[PDB]
Design an enzyme around this catalytic site. Structure first.
Site, PDB file in Angstrom:
ATOM      1  N   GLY A 194       0.856  -1.208   0.186  1.00 15.92           N
ATOM      2  CA  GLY A 194       0.217   0.410   0.275  1.00 15.92           C
ATOM      3  C   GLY A 194       1.058   1.386   0.096  1.00 15.92           C
ATOM      4  N   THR A 242      -1.497  12.734   3.782  1.00 21.84           N
ATOM      5  CA  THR A 242      -0.893  11.558   2.837  1.00 21.84           C
ATOM      6  C   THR A 242      -1.808  11.591   2.052  1.00 21.84           C
ATOM      7  OG1 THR A 242      -2.694  10.532   3.670  1.00 21.84           O
ATOM      8  CG2 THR A 242      -0.474   9.889   4.550  1.00 21.84           C
ATOM      9  N   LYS A 272     -11.952   0.162  10.247  1.00 25.33           N
ATOM     10  CA  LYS A 272     -11.456   0.214  11.262  1.00 25.33           C
ATOM     11  C   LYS A 272     -12.012  -1.038  12.348  1.00 25.33           C
ATOM     12  CE  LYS A 272      -9.166   2.472   8.260  1.00 25.33           C
ATOM     13  NZ  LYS A 272      -7.605   1.705   7.638  1.00 25.33           N
ATOM     14  N   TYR A 304     -16.057   9.482   8.529  1.00 26.58           N
ATOM     15  CA  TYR A 304     -15.165   8.759   8.542  1.00 26.58           C
ATOM     16  C   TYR A 304     -16.445   7.073   7.878  1.00 26.58           C
ATOM     17  CZ  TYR A 304     -11.125   6.012   9.147  1.00 26.58           C
ATOM     18  OH  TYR A 304      -9.782   5.274   9.081  1.00 26.58           O
ATOM     19  N   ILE A 336      -2.955  -0.514   3.248  1.00 25.91           N
ATOM     20  CA  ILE A 336      -3.988  -0.651   2.768  1.00 25.91           C
ATOM     21  C   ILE A 336      -5.615  -0.362   3.361  1.00 25.91           C
ATOM     22  CG2 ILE A 336      -6.150  -1.221   0.693  1.00 25.91           C
ATOM     23  CD1 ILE A 336      -2.740  -3.599   0.443  1.00 25.91           C
ATOM     24  N   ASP A 380      -3.716  -5.757  -6.696  1.00 23.01           N
ATOM     25  CA  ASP A 380      -5.150  -5.137  -5.893  1.00 23.01           C
ATOM     26  C   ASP A 380      -5.585  -6.504  -5.077  1.00 23.01           C
ATOM     27  OD1 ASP A 380      -7.917  -4.842  -5.634  1.00 23.01           O
ATOM     28  OD2 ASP A 380      -7.229  -3.215  -7.680  1.00 23.01           O
ATOM     29  N   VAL A 381      -5.836  -5.680  -4.062  1.00 26.17           N
ATOM     30  CA  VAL A 381      -6.347  -6.987  -2.646  1.00 26.17           C
ATOM     31  C   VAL A 381      -7.935  -7.665  -3.197  1.00 26.17           C
ATOM     32  CG1 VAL A 381      -4.459  -6.122  -0.860  1.00 26.17           C
ATOM     33  CG2 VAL A 381      -6.903  -4.844  -1.077  1.00 26.17           C
ATOM     34  N   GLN A 435      -0.615  -0.551  -5.988  1.00 25.04           N
ATOM     35  CA  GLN A 435      -2.303  -1.072  -6.227  1.00 25.04           C
ATOM     36  C   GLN A 435      -2.543  -1.502  -7.678  1.00 25.04           C
ATOM     37  OE1 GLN A 435      -5.196   1.522  -4.854  1.00 25.04           O
ATOM     38  NE2 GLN A 435      -6.497   0.126  -6.268  1.00 25.04           N
ATOM     39  N   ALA A 445      -3.888   9.640   0.375  1.00 27.54           N
ATOM     40  CA  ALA A 445      -5.533   9.112   1.090  1.00 27.54           C
ATOM     41  C   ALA A 445      -6.241  10.219   1.791  1.00 27.54           C
ATOM     42  CB  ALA A 445      -5.639   7.781   2.051  1.00 27.54           C
ATOM     43  N   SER A 456       3.379   8.599   1.855  1.00 26.34           N
ATOM     44  CA  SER A 456       2.686   7.050   2.823  1.00 26.34           C
ATOM     45  C   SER A 456       2.694   6.474   4.028  1.00 26.34           C
ATOM     46  CB  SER A 456       2.363   5.864   1.170  1.00 26.34           C
ATOM     47  OG  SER A 456       2.128   6.320  -0.256  1.00 26.34           O
TER      48      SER A 456
HETATM   49  N1  LIG Z   1      -3.357   8.999   7.039  1.00 23.89           N
HETATM   50  C1  LIG Z   1      -3.774   8.910   7.863  1.00 23.89           C
HETATM   51  O1  LIG Z   1      -3.943  10.251   8.447  1.00 23.89           O
HETATM   52  C2  LIG Z   1      -4.311   7.344   8.589  1.00 23.89           C
HETATM   53  C3  LIG Z   1      -4.473   7.625   9.967  1.00 23.89           C
HETATM   54  C4  LIG Z   1      -4.819   6.661  10.361  1.00 23.89           C
HETATM   55  C5  LIG Z   1      -4.944   5.655   9.786  1.00 23.89           C
HETATM   56  N2  LIG Z   1      -4.416   5.479   8.341  1.00 23.89           N
HETATM   57  C6  LIG Z   1      -3.924   4.582   7.177  1.00 23.89           C
HETATM   58  O2  LIG Z   1      -2.731   4.258   6.744  1.00 23.89           O
HETATM   59  C7  LIG Z   1      -3.393   3.794   6.008  1.00 23.89           C
HETATM   60  C8  LIG Z   1      -1.947   3.846   4.809  1.00 23.89           C
HETATM   61  O3  LIG Z   1      -3.274   4.737   4.030  1.00 23.89           O
HETATM   62  P1  LIG Z   1      -2.298   6.730   4.014  1.00 23.89           P
HETATM   63  O4  LIG Z   1      -2.306   7.704   4.732  1.00 23.89           O
HETATM   64  O5  LIG Z   1      -0.401   6.345   3.944  1.00 23.89           O
HETATM   65  O6  LIG Z   1      -2.869   7.207   2.324  1.00 23.89           O
HETATM   66  P2  LIG Z   1      -1.964   6.675   1.209  1.00 23.89           P
HETATM   67  O7  LIG Z   1      -2.796   6.740  -0.082  1.00 23.89           O
HETATM   68  O8  LIG Z   1      -0.526   6.458   0.880  1.00 23.89           O
HETATM   69  O9  LIG Z   1      -1.864   4.787   1.398  1.00 23.89           O
HETATM   70  C9  LIG Z   1      -3.500   3.614   0.970  1.00 23.89           C
HETATM   71  C10 LIG Z   1      -3.332   2.323   0.132  1.00 23.89           C
HETATM   72  O10 LIG Z   1      -4.411   1.856   0.183  1.00 23.89           O
HETATM   73  C11 LIG Z   1      -4.094   1.391  -1.555  1.00 23.89           C
HETATM   74  N3  LIG Z   1      -4.965   0.301  -1.837  1.00 23.89           N
HETATM   75  C12 LIG Z   1      -6.476   0.928  -1.827  1.00 23.89           C
HETATM   76  N4  LIG Z   1      -7.500   0.112  -3.016  1.00 23.89           N
HETATM   77  C13 LIG Z   1      -6.166  -0.909  -2.932  1.00 23.89           C
HETATM   78  C14 LIG Z   1      -6.729  -1.966  -3.440  1.00 23.89           C
HETATM   79  N5  LIG Z   1      -7.500  -2.364  -3.886  1.00 23.89           N
HETATM   80  N6  LIG Z   1      -5.414  -2.943  -3.528  1.00 23.89           N
HETATM   81  C15 LIG Z   1      -3.980  -3.050  -3.386  1.00 23.89           C
HETATM   82  N7  LIG Z   1      -4.144  -1.590  -2.569  1.00 23.89           N
HETATM   83  C16 LIG Z   1      -5.242  -0.586  -2.205  1.00 23.89           C
HETATM   84  C17 LIG Z   1      -4.026   2.707  -2.472  1.00 23.89           C
HETATM   85  O11 LIG Z   1      -2.652   2.341  -3.560  1.00 23.89           O
HETATM   86  C18 LIG Z   1      -2.433   3.760  -1.121  1.00 23.89           C
HETATM   87  O12 LIG Z   1      -1.067   3.349  -1.475  1.00 23.89           O
HETATM   88  C19 LIG Z   1      -4.428   3.054   5.842  1.00 23.89           C
HETATM   89  O13 LIG Z   1      -4.949   1.473   6.242  1.00 23.89           O
HETATM   90  C20 LIG Z   1      -5.164   4.054   6.460  1.00 23.89           C
HETATM   91  O14 LIG Z   1      -6.538   4.028   6.626  1.00 23.89           O
HETATM   92  C21 LIG Z   1      -4.558   6.856   7.712  1.00 23.89           C
HETATM   93  O1  LIG Z   2      -7.494   5.901   8.036  1.00 21.78           O
HETATM   94  C1  LIG Z   2      -7.250   7.247   7.136  1.00 21.78           C
HETATM   95  C2  LIG Z   2      -7.299   8.030   8.484  1.00 21.78           C
HETATM   96  C3  LIG Z   2      -7.304   9.468   8.097  1.00 21.78           C
HETATM   97 CL1  LIG Z   2      -7.725  11.060   9.272  1.00 21.78          CL
HETATM   98  C4  LIG Z   2      -6.531  10.065   6.929  1.00 21.78           C
HETATM   99  C5  LIG Z   2      -6.843   8.873   6.127  1.00 21.78           C
HETATM  100  C6  LIG Z   2      -6.939   8.204   5.926  1.00 21.78           C
HETATM  101  O2  LIG Z   2      -7.194   6.182   5.091  1.00 21.78           O
HETATM  102  C7  LIG Z   2      -7.655   6.892   4.352  1.00 21.78           C
HETATM  103  C8  LIG Z   2      -9.112   7.550   4.412  1.00 21.78           C
HETATM  104  C9  LIG Z   2     -10.296   7.330   3.550  1.00 21.78           C
HETATM  105  C10 LIG Z   2      -9.462   5.942   2.218  1.00 21.78           C
HETATM  106 CL2  LIG Z   2     -10.843   5.930   0.406  1.00 21.78          CL
HETATM  107  C11 LIG Z   2      -8.544   5.819   2.343  1.00 21.78           C
HETATM  108  C12 LIG Z   2      -7.536   5.601   3.023  1.00 21.78           C
HETATM  109 CL3  LIG Z   2      -6.384   5.123   2.760  1.00 21.78          CL
END
Ligand SMILES: NC(=O)c1ccc[n+]([C@@H]2O[C@H](COP(=O)([O-])OP(=O)(O)OC[C@H]3O[C@@H](n4cnc5c(N)ncnc54)[C@H](O)[C@@H]3O)[C@@H](O)[C@H]2O)c1
Ligand SMILES: Oc1cc(Cl)ccc1Oc1ccc(Cl)cc1Cl
Ligand SMILES: NC(=O)c1ccc[n+]([C@@H]2O[C@H](COP(=O)([O-])OP(=O)(O)OC[C@H]3O[C@@H](n4cnc5c(N)ncnc54)[C@H](O)[C@@H]3O)[C@@H](O)[C@H]2O)c1
Ligand SMILES: NC(=O)c1ccc[n+]([C@@H]2O[C@H](COP(=O)([O-])OP(=O)(O)OC[C@H]3O[C@@H](n4cnc5c(N)ncnc54)[C@H](O)[C@@H]3O)[C@@H](O)[C@H]2O)c1
Ligand SMILES: NC(=O)c1ccc[n+]([C@@H]2O[C@H](COP(=O)([O-])OP(=O)(O)OC[C@H]3O[C@@H](n4cnc5c(N)ncnc54)[C@H](O)[C@@H]3O)[C@@H](O)[C@H]2O)c1
Ligand SMILES: Oc1cc(Cl)ccc1Oc1ccc(Cl)cc1Cl
Ligand SMILES: Oc1cc(Cl)ccc1Oc1ccc(Cl)cc1Cl
Ligand SMILES: Oc1cc(Cl)ccc1Oc1ccc(Cl)cc1Cl
Lengths: 259, 258, 258, 258
Positions: free
Chosen positions: B15, B195, B164, B157, B94, B66-67, B42, B197, B21
């Site tokens: 991911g 990020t 989650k 959310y 992911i 792709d998962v 992905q 996302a 990321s």
């Molecule tokens: N950014 C935040 O503040 C935050 C906070 C808490 C948790 N998270 C979690 O952290 C993890 C990483 O997210 P991030 O914030 O680094 O954003 P990111 O976009 O960099 O990472 C998310 C990844 O999920 C991958 N993905 C989505 N659908 C997919 C699929 N069908 N197959 C394969 N890969 C797929 C995307 O290609 C992407 O690289 C996620 O689980 C997100 O919920 C993020």
């Molecule tokens: O889980 C998350 C939590 C926060 Cl605060 C910010 C980004 C996050 O990550 C996501 C949020 C929505 C979607 Cl559609 C995909 C992803 Cl990876």
């Protein structure tokens, strides 16, 4: 004396199979308290049992709906709207996971089995809450049934544990979104009760005896104890309680290691 | 000084989109610690940037998967097995939920959007754990990323909160099932970090502001704070820790009202 | 390789009795990382073995302080202030409940026994945090030790469960209050370890063997695993983490049954 | 219609000062339902209100008891035993922290103030549970009152938060210890209600007003909503429920942000 009188109130209770069903236990107390009760059953094969339940209540409307079938859900709420006008109470007592998912390891859950378990056991609450929303009157409520394995690992409960985690989080979000209409949403976390679905958990009898050994009350809970908590949460007595998971498990879940 | 040496260890980080990321933050720390790191991305669309990440690591194998596609996952773990012979660490970074699911009310979530969210964001941990299991060595581990909304309502959310919650209960069961083979499973609950996302969460800036206002540390966390926690959990320093959701959120989630 | 280098950092570890003490494990790891470590011990009868621990750490500074005696706490922090100038890390590894309280039922706990248990095992954290506050540097931290009986009923842990609930709530409030200053406060919820204090819990050996049978990892944790988590939480690797209770218990507390 | 008839049952409600007291709301419901109620008030100065409360219920035995005074507690239960012969229900609606402990920072709490807060607000449940035990009939129960700051930091609630964490942990242990005799122990976590004691929390009105804006139900709870939950938990309708903290707060504490 205190009286709980729900005359004038309308209840839909989804997920009844027989008289041991926890949905049915809640339906019985709601009917006893004076509400008009509609029961929904899953499939035509269950119509004869649903008829026996309507009869045991002294009268209830019956509707068939599979919660995977959006057409059937639309038809259900259309039927309930026509019969009732508005709705006060919705009891969601539906869960399923494929036998193979429950018998193997959680890690070995097949994609389509995992998705079906979540679909039936958690998404269905959203499906029915959305359809119920325009019908539900101020003061009304939705109550679902969950289990402790959402929080702590119970061997063999597997994907259902995960579905119940999704179900409880759903309860909080739906409570937040329906609250401004004065509609409450709560979960009853019941301890083990010997229902039809009890047979679908391998080692259920072990769970059951274990709970009776270790729980503070040193006994299992009863169907009626679940029924009474559902009655309370739906009744105006619980008017300040929403978004909660309330345990009726003889205290089992508060326990750490004993002996 | 105390040393974390992961020479000889093999990691798969699933991911990554770019250098911001969270999965890439953990990748960079594992690589710095001396582990060999494979990345999964992905879709063919993301490959050029995946190659820039592989480069920023001083080399990393790349695999596309792709998962939602079980055959792509099969191919991914065949590829890792051939390249590495086995695995020590798996990072699951992911998540996805349709834009409509995240823009509306949770109660209005469409059946197929709901199911896709749970499939990509929660079931995927199970799908990759199963496949990784025969490869995973003793002392090995899986780490995923979650958010506080599993426990408490964060408006908008929506279905991701529910995913989650499913992810966290999955962590507990998977810890129970993999623990006998000496493999740990944990979740990192990160506070908000910018990020790619994060741009899919409409209220993100508001969430970020609330955290800075309310959190004990009076600031938001950093990407590196997530990376360091992932490193720790995957390392031998965390050998007694499994089945846990560990918060890296500047203390936000312990706060009530102010 | 990653290096955790705490050269120039100063630590006070309160509550060492012998080589098995959890506070000692964390002291040893802080010393390994290069911190200067002072130790405090409770009473003259413990001094001989405490000196051996100090010797084991390259001749650590040693202070006597009973946490029920405010004068001894004042002298302790004055002595730390004089020796170090300031403080980075504070480890609070102190609990007590009278034998009467632990051997009976919780409901039968005598007023004075219950108050002493709370005073020594919970209030002490506030008492030392307050005195440490003006010495504590940005990036600094306090770590305490707790047990899962705060949340779940563990027969015969009795008043100590209640003291630990008070302790964990104290950790949240202190994290909130010390956070503006860039000081973090956390708790380590350790699984059973065979320390001298373990003898104060009736049936502890039964409890210990039960954990080995049912924890995800099918073993107890080690004293060193506690020491490593203490090191991590105090280190800058954990800079995003405050107000947390982190479990190092081989996953035991995630199990719901059997 | 379904009825709750507590005719024949005997209740002691401890901690009434006011017709707005949460203890009084529970007593009113118990009396409505058919129970014979006894009330204890803290000090001679509350007698006149106590008497008016006893009038308001339609009759109620009155006793004076300060929970710090073991002799006054012994006399309370001897008096109750004399008048009723047994007890079915005990309501514990008593808490206190010194003004100075509430008005500043938790970290600044003085030893004597911290101890007294814990003694009155947490230990008193054990003291009264112990004395009630031999009077309490099968099907009997104890209910206490708590607040969500036990789990989440509410500034200025300070040591009361810590006392409530101790109280809720005490509920779990007393439920375990009294369960074998068919006696249940539970806590009501009430949201803000305007009582005499509420005014002893700095900023209470703003806390109160904030809930009405952010709670799922978009209002505050009522005294009667607390009374109804107390009645329910003590009645046979709740016979399967013990060791539980049940929230009556219009959903407020489920919110994680905004
Ligand atoms: N950014 C935040 O503040 C935050 C906070 C808490 C948790 N998270 C979690 O952290 C993890 C990483 O997210 P991030 O914030 O680094 O954003 P990111 O976009 O960099 O990472 C998310 C990844 O999920 C991958 N993905 C989505 N659908 C997919 C699929 N069908 N197959 C394969 N890969 C797929 C995307 O290609 C992407 O690289 C996620 O689980 C997100 O919920 C993020
Ligand atoms: O889980 C998350 C939590 C926060 Cl605060 C910010 C980004 C996050 O990550 C996501 C949020 C929505 C979607 Cl559609 C995909 C992803 Cl990876
Ligand atoms: N029995 C227990 O010990 C226990 C404990 C805790 C929670 N619960 C929960 O209580 C609820 C009721 O289960 P129960 O124990 O009364 O068993 P039950 O078998 O009596 O009821 C389960 C119902 O789910 C219905 N159902 C399953 N799939 C459906 C679908 N696709 N569409 C429509 N209906 C469907 C069945 O027809 C059945 O009526 C479930 O959510 C269960 O998880 C049960
Ligand atoms: N060992 C375990 O399985 C375990 C598990 C979880 C938590 N803990 C916690 O870890 C901490 C350390 O305990 P340990 O197991 O290392 O045992 P230990 O006996 O080595 O340490 C406990 C220390 O508390 C000190 N102490 C007691 N009363 C004191 C007072 N009045 N003033 C100053 N010091 C006092 C003792 O001198 C002793 O050094 C405790 O808080 C304990 O509750 C231990
Ligand atoms: N009012 C709220 O918004 C709220 C919310 C959550 C919990 N609570 C809890 O509900 C309970 C009842 O408080 P209330 O709000 O009804 O206020 P109240 O002032 O009406 O009741 C508090 C009672 O505690 C008693 N008390 C204090 N010290 C005592 C002592 N040493 N010995 C005997 N009695 C003593 C007082 O006499 C008083 O009657 C308390 O435990 C409180 O913490 C209140
Ligand atoms: O959730 C439950 C928990 C318990 Cl202890 C007993 C029965 C339960 O209900 C189910 C369990 C498994 C399946 Cl497949 C379907 C249902 Cl309705
Ligand atoms: O808290 C603890 C938990 C465990 Cl499993 C083992 C030891 C512990 O520590 C104590 C237990 C009782 C007493 Cl009187 C004093 C202390 Cl230090
Ligand atoms: O616990 C409480 C919580 C709230 Cl929201 C309101 C009142 C409360 O009750 C008290 C608060 C402070 C003190 Cl000194 C004594 C009592 Cl009884």
């Amino acid at each position: 004396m205190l009286t709980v009188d729900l005359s004038g109130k309308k209840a839909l209770v989804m997920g009844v199979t027989n008289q041991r069903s926890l949905g049915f236990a809640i339906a019985a107390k709601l009917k006893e308290a004076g509400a008009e009760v509609a029961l929904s059953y899953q499939a035509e094969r269950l119509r004869p049992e649903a008829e026996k339940l309507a009869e045991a209540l002294g009268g209830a409307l019956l509707f068939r709906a599979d919660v995977t079938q959006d057409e059937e859900l639309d038809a259900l709420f259309a039927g309930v709207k026509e019969a009732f006008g508005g709705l006060d109470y919705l009891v969601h007592a539906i869960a399923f996971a494929p036998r193979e998912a429950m018998e193997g390891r959680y890690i070995d859950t097949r994609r389509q089995d995992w998705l079906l378990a979540l679909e039936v056991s958690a998404y269905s609450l959203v499906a029915v809450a959305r359809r119920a929303e325009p019908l539900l009157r101020e003061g009304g409520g939705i109550v679902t049934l969950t289990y402790y394995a959402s929080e702590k690992v119970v061997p063999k409960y597997n994907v259902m544990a995960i579905a119940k985690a999704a179900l409880e989080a759903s309860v909080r979000y739906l409570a937040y979104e329906l609250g401004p209409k004065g509609v409450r949403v709560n979960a009853i976390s019941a301890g083990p009760v010997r229902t039809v679905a009890a047979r679908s958990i391998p080692g259920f009898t072990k769970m059951y005896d274990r709970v009776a050994q270790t729980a503070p009350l040193r006994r299992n809970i009863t169907q009626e104890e679940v029924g009474n908590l559902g009655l309370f949460l739906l009744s105006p007595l619980a008017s300040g309680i929403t978004g909660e998971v309330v345990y009726v498990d003889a205290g089992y879940h508060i326990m750490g290691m004993e002996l």
